[PDB]
Amino acid sequence: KLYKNIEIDTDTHSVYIHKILLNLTLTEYKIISFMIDQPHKVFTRGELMNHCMNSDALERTVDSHVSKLRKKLEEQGIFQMLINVRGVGYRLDNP
Amino acid sequence: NKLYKNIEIDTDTHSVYIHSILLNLTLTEYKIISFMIDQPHKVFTRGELMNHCMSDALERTVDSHVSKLRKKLEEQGIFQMLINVRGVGYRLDNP
Amino acid sequence: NKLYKNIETDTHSVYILLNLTLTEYKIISFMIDQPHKVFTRGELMNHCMNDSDALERTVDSHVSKLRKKLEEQGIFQMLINVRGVGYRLDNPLAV
Amino acid sequence: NKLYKNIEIDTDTHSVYIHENKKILLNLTLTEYKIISFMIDQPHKVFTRGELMNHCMNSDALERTVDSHVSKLRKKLEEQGIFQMLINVRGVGYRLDN
Amino acid sequence: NKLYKNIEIDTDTHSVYINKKILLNLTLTEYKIISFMIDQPHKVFTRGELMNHCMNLERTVDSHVSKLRKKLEEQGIFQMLINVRGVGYRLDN
Amino acid sequence: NKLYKNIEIDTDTHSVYIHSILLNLTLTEYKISFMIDQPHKVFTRGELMNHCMNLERTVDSHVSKLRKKLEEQIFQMLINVRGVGYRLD
DNA sequence: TAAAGTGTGGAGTAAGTGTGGAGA
DNA sequence: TTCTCCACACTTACTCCACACTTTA
DNA sequence: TAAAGTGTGGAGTAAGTGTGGAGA
DNA sequence: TTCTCCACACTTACTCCACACTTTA
Numbered sequence: 160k161l162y163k164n165i166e167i168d169t170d171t172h173s174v175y176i177h178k179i180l181l182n183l184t185l186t187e188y189k190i191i192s193f194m195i196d197q198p199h200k201v202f203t204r205g206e207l208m209n210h211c212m213n214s215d216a217l218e219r220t221v222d223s224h225v226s227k228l229r230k231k232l233e234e235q236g237i238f239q240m241l242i243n244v245r246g247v248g249y250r251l252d253n254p
Numbered sequence: 255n256k257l258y259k260n261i262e263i264d265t266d267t268h269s270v271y272i273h274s275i276l277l278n279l280t281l282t283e284y285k286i287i288s289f290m291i292d293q294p295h296k297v298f299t300r301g302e303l304m305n306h307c308m309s310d311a312l313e314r315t316v317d318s319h320v321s322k323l324r325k326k327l328e329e330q331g332i333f334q335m336l337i338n339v340r341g342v343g344y345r346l347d348n349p
Numbered sequence: 350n351k352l353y354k355n356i357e358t359d360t361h362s363v364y365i366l367l368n369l370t371l372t373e374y375k376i377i378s379f380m381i382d383q384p385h386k387v388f389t390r391g392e393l394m395n396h397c398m399n400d401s402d403a404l405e406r407t408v409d410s411h412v413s414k415l416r417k418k419l420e421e422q423g424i425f426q427m428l429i430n431v432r433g434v435g436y437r438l439d440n441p442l443a444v
Numbered sequence: 445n446k447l448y449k450n451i452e453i454d455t456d457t458h459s460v461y462i463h464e465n466k467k468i469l470l471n472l473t474l475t476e477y478k479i480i481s482f483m484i485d486q487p488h489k490v491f492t493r494g495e496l497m498n499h500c501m502n503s504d505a506l507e508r509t510v511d512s513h514v515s516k517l518r519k520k521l522e523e524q525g526i527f528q529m530l531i532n533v534r535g536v537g538y539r540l541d542n
Numbered sequence: 543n544k545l546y547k548n549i550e551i552d553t554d555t556h557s558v559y560i561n562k563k564i565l566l567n568l569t570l571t572e573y574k575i576i577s578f579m580i581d582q583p584h585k586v587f588t589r590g591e592l593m594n595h596c597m598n599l600e601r602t603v604d605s606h607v608s609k610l611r612k613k614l615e616e617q618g619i620f621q622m623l624i625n626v627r628g629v630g631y632r633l634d635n
Numbered sequence: 636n637k638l639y640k641n642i643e644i645d646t647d648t649h650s651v652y653i654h655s656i657l658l659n660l661t662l663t664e665y666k667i668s669f670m671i672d673q674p675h676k677v678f679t680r681g682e683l684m685n686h687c688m689n690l691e692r693t694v695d696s697h698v699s700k701l702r703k704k705l706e707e708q709i710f711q712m713l714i715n716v717r718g719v720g721y722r723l724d
Numbered sequence: 725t726a727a728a729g730t731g732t733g734g735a736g737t738a739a740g741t742g743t744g745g746a747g748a
Numbered sequence: 749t750t751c752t753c754c755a756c757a758c759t760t761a762c763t764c765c766a767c768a769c770t771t772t773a
Numbered sequence: 774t775a776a777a778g779t780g781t782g783g784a785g786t787a788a789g790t791g792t793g794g795a796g797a
Numbered sequence: 798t799t800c801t802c803c804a805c806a807c808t809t810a811c812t813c814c815a816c817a818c819t820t821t822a
Contacts (some may be wrong), residue, residue, distance in 0.1 A: 164567070179648055182661055184800060199807080201458045210292045212801085215302045219789090220802050226791055236567060238614075243789060244458055246474045254459070254469065267385045268431060276443035280762065281433045308763085314729085315764055321731055331421055338729060340772065370751060389456045396485045400753075406740085407753055413742050430740060432762075473811060501812085507812050508778090513781055532778060534821070660800095696798080 162195050163252065164237070165220055169223040176235040187228045203248040225249055260332070272330040273320065274344050282308055283323045290346040299343040320344055353381050354439065355424070372398055373415045380428075380438040384430065389435040412436055447506070448484050449541065455481070462524040470524065475500055476517045487540040509521045512539055545578050547634065548619070553577070560617040570598055572610045579633040588630040607631055639671050641709070649723075653709060663688055670723045671680075679720040694720075706718045 160166045166175040174181045174191055183191065189211035194202060204218040212224070229241040242250050256263040260270040270277045270287055279287065285307035290298060300313040308319070324336040337345050350358050356377070357364040363377055375397035380388060390405040398411070416428045428438045446453040452461040453496065460480055461467040478500035483491060493507040501513070518530040531539050544551040558566045558576055565632040568576065573594035579587060589603045597606065611623040624632050640673050643652040644667065651658045651667055657701040660667065666687035680694040680697060688697065702713040714722045 180650060180657065180659065182659060197456070199457050199459075201456070209289065209306075213293075213296065213302070214802085214812070215299075215305060219804090222789065223791075223802075226789090230791080238564065238567070242528070245457055245788065245809095245821060254457075266383070266387075267437075267441060268387045268434060269385075274442060281431075282763070311764060314766095317729065318731075318764075325731080337770095340728065347738090372752070393481060395499070398752085399489070401482075401491070403499055403753065405767095406755095409740060410742075410753075413740090417742080432739060453820075475812070498780090503813080505813060508815095511778065512780075512782060519780080532820095702810085 160192070160196060162198050163189070165195065165240075167192050174212045176232075176237060179235050181231055181235065183247060184224075184233065185226070187231070188225050190224060191251075192227055194249075198251040199254055201244045201247050207248065256288065256291055258294050260268075261291065261335075262288070262289060263288050269285075272332060275330055277326055277330065279323070279326065280319075282319050283326070286323055289345070294346040295349045296299060296340045296344050297345045301343075303343065316343075351381050352377065353384050356381065365422075367418055369415070369418065370411075372411050373418070374416055377438075380436075384438040385441045387431045387434050387437045393436070411442060446484050447540050448487050451480070451484065451529075453481050455485060462521075462526060465506065468524050470520055471518065472517070475513050476520070479513060479517055483538070488542070490536050490539045491538040496537065544580055546583050549576075549580065551577050551580060560614075560619060566613055566617070568610070568613065569606075571576055573605050574614070575606060575610055576633075579631070583633040584635065586596070586626045586629050586632045590630075592630065637668065639674050642667070642671065642687075643673065644668050644671060653705075658704055659704070660701070660704065663697055667701060670721070674723040677716045677720055677722045681699050681720075683720065 160169060164177045166177065167173070167190070168175070170190060174188065177185055190207060191206070194200075204221040207221050207225070208214075208216065208218065212221070220244050225241055232238075232240050240251060242253055244250050256265060258259070260273045262268070262273065264271070265288070268284060270279055270284065289306050290296075300316040303316050303320070303337060304311070304313065308316070320336055327333075327335050334348075335346060337348060339345055352431070354422065361374060363369055363374065368439075369377065376393060379393070379396050380386075390408040393408050394401055394405065398408070400407075412428050419425075419427050427439060429440055431437055446455065450463045452463065452467065453459070454461070461476065462469045462470065464525075474486055479496060482496070483489075484497050489529060493510040496510050496514070497503065497505065497507065501510070512530050513528055521527075521529050531542055533539050548560060550559070550563075552559070555631060556573060558573065568598060570610055575592060578592070578595050579585075583615065589600060592607070593603055597603070607623055614620075614622050624635060626632055637646060641654045643654065644650070645652070646668070648666060651660055669683070669686050670676075678706060680691055683698070684694055687695070695715075698713055698715075705712050714724050716721065716722055
């Protein structure tokens, strides 16, 4: 499963940058693997929470998981991914 | 589009299908199955199911909604779904 | 001309010709695009009414008045309410 | 995707495009997105300021503030060569193209 | 430190930068193209010149230029890498 | 690529391989790359801290967690030298 | 055996229907 | 006026809880 | 000419980011 | 512990309103 220099091997559970392997947490893996299906879609915090976490936690906690993932992407020279869409949620890539 | 192992949920029509047939689900029952199919293997607590799929009523009332859904699944030949995880809550499917 | 199961655009006619109000015409013409979709009251209000600031219950009354007109031409079980969500033009089959 | 006369709104991405023969993406604010997405349902309908406020702002603010949101949206439409949209209907409110 | 109209190429680091100051993820071929053409921005380079200078049938040349162009457009830089029909390409009019 | 007795480190990809498998190392854990230069040398906790970790038990814990990842596959590799530090051997 | 979960069944009440009527 | 909207009571059926049976450590 | 609408600009404030740290 | 979540301050940019100009009957 591939999108613009980000490869996810689902079996078993590795995410590569074009190949550098990332050290992702389980939550972080779920986020990137969920959003890469529809890269340009805006996912709400509620959707990311239900699909990638665990509560039942705060919506701000979603933001922090996305931040931590983003930092890991930037340290492999991938910037302008995980863009926030103010008041709605997040998007993997904008057209 | 939501699909998982012979259970299809069309979110636009509010329909849930079994492959082999449309189920007559209540709104609460629809929310439960649509919530849990996001993370099939995850154990959801009664508190999570209550806040997402139902008042701050009793936790036992969650059990009854899950039971009624389970029965409807079993009458379409689906038995190994909605497993209770003792003292925590419920899981859609074991890994 | 939009056709769906015994219910038949430039003329503003719905067919045997029905005497529909403008609101009523908009409702039936809006919902026939996606017959089996559940439309919320908010969607019907924004698309088919004046006073988007009106009550959601007023949507129900427009649908009722349309339904009555459909039933007097021998069309029953059509504008089905989906409790807590909204309305649907027709239920899907269990096939 | 909501379409009306050279204005496309993709609701999943939250994107609004202008179409000759390429799609230009607009940089709308959330309020601005709600306005255009609300009014495109009934293009020819006159929406009052009260309707736009309740549906697109989320405030108890002044009605003149609605005008400013519509203005800012209009300017963004005009810079993509779209002039005949967002017509004011004096004393009532606003309408998408006549 | 080659500069031209909002495009900076640092030749020592092999970095190209584009509202400060976004680094582009260019391939080696792509780097050579942009670094070659920025010397004479307005010059029309032939496909033969770009091939000999930047690429170590014709659709492949065009494809390298396309992929570079897309990377420029995602940083809000459009109407760069203009094709001159039957000859080749130009960085800017 | 840095090689030593069935442990390969590719420095360009930041990957560490076991011969027989890619390891899922943290950045701190990757910084195995320091000790493989002088496999038999005893590195102090102070040296490992300054070079790899951008009280004393915390250094030990990083080394332990690396060791466990080696053992899940390679045993007897990150030998502790009591009170002083660690050796790859 | 306690501890916890399942499942049928019914009372209350949430939610929707539709007649009627006031305002433009 | 008609049509749109709202009001008021009618009407429907789902949600919740009860009580007993069954399963699990 | 009144009346109403447009549009630039600025003050306050939502909303998002990311470091840091407590709990399992 | 690590990871998950939450808190706090930093930072960004959108909303709202003001004030004057412009447009319409």
